[PDB]
Amino acid sequence: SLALSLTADQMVSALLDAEPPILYSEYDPTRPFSEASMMGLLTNLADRELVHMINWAKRVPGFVDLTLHDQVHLLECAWLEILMIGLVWRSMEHPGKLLFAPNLLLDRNQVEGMVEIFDMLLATSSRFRMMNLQGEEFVCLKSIILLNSGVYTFLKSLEEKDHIHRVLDKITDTLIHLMAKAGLTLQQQHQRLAQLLLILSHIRHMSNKGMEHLYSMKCKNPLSDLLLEMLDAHR
């Protein structure tokens, strides 16, 4: 494929160029908002982000090479993880706050037993900050999640799994390439690589916890048809 033959700098350039835009919310500072209203903002925002994520995923090297049914599965597994790491990345320069949108900046003091998830998102954001996470590293991490999160919930289909692993190794090479160019020693490269990848475990945790909270909100009754279908995939 085209993916396996790309150089490290080409991989970075391809990923940076494929970056989705930062959307705005319908948030009105003057309007009163209930927990239902704030959720409406977040659900609506996420729904519009999903459309961009889907087109973004198609420009991740190697993803299009996969069968359609496998593309569906990976996105169904990783969509909330990708949204969340996106949120955490945008919130990096805003300590104590989560930047859902340029016009939507929330603190921990703002509801319906989601504060626990907020604090985890805030901690991850603080983690990125102290590590001084780079954009080139972020786009690599986000592509790793897409390809990795659902790769073990997949009889001729084993060849598909091998191809995903090859691409995953390319991205690892790319990450190392970035850290080496930043002047990190060998020991520092491996350490930083490990630190970045352990964060994905926490991102998986936040997504799972999020999916649980989404299921209860659904049964309480404001979700889009796409979000509903994505949610049902986990159940």
Binding site: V51, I54, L68, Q71, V72, L75, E76, D225, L226, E229
Partner: peptide, 10 residues
């Protein structure tokens, strides 16, 4: 399936 549909668009 909405996701199945949006993916295969071209």
């Amino acid at each position: 399936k909405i996701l199945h549909r949006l993916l295969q668009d071209s």
